[PDB]
Design an enzyme around this catalytic site. Structure first.
Site, PDB file in Angstrom:
ATOM      1  CD  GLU A 293      -2.823  -1.096   0.539  1.00 49.53           C
ATOM      2  OE1 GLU A 293      -3.453  -1.789   0.350  1.00 49.53           O
ATOM      3  OE2 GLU A 293      -2.789  -0.124  -0.213  1.00 49.53           O
TER       4      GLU A 293
ATOM      5  CG  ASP B  38      -8.621   3.063  -3.432  1.00 43.37           C
ATOM      6  OD1 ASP B  38      -9.108   2.648  -2.543  1.00 43.37           O
ATOM      7  OD2 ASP B  38      -8.763   4.426  -4.503  1.00 43.37           O
TER       8      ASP B  38
END
Ligand SMILES: [Cl-]
Length: 162
Positions: A11, A20
């Site tokens: 991440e 994202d």
């Protein structure tokens, strides 16, 4: 390698609100703030989560506190879920980490609907399970990550992260 190191690799660390794969507003180590296109809505969620007026910027410790909470919530979500628990109980330690990774990223509900793959993992059919996992919006949209998580289920080692 352990689940925290794995996720930190997947991440990354960002101390400012960003979006994202899926254009969703996030912060820290993959913390989802909200699905609303509103950035003001995100900043509001952030202040609530942190407990202070952050103006969209956090510290590294703050990021770490959120990540610890999120990994805990993912594990507990697996153990309470009727469809996920039996799959987790049947797996070895590395594969368990990969299932935690999926849940952290897409939630209980979302992983729970991958009915066919879950059954193959349960049955130890690793290669077939890897093929099946690759046919999903998940992978088409965010391929690199998906790739590592899928290899991990495929070989049962930490090679894709090494
Ligand atoms: Cl597909």
């Amino acid at each position: 390698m352990n689940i925290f190191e794995m996720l930190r690799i997947d991440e990354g660390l960002r101390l400012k609100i960003y979006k994202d794969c899926e254009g969703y507003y996030t912060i820290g180590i993959g913390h989802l703030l909200t699905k609303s296109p509103s950035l003001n809505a995100a900043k509001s969620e952030l202040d609530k989560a942190i407990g202070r007026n952050t103006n969209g910027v956090i510290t590294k410790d703050e990021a770490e506190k959120l990540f610890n909470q999120d990994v805990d919530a993912a594990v507990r979500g697996i153990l309470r879920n009727a469809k996920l628990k039996p799959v987790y109980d049947s797996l070895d330690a590395v594969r368990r980490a990969a299932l935690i990774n999926m849940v952290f990223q897409m939630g209980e509900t979302g992983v729970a609907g991958f009915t066919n793959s879950l059954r193959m993992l349960q049955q130890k059919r690793w290669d077939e399970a890897a093929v099946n996992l690759a046919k999903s919006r998940w992978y088409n949209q965010c391929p690199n990550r998906a790739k590592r998580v899928i290899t991990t289920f495929r070989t049962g080692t930490w090679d894709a992260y090494k």
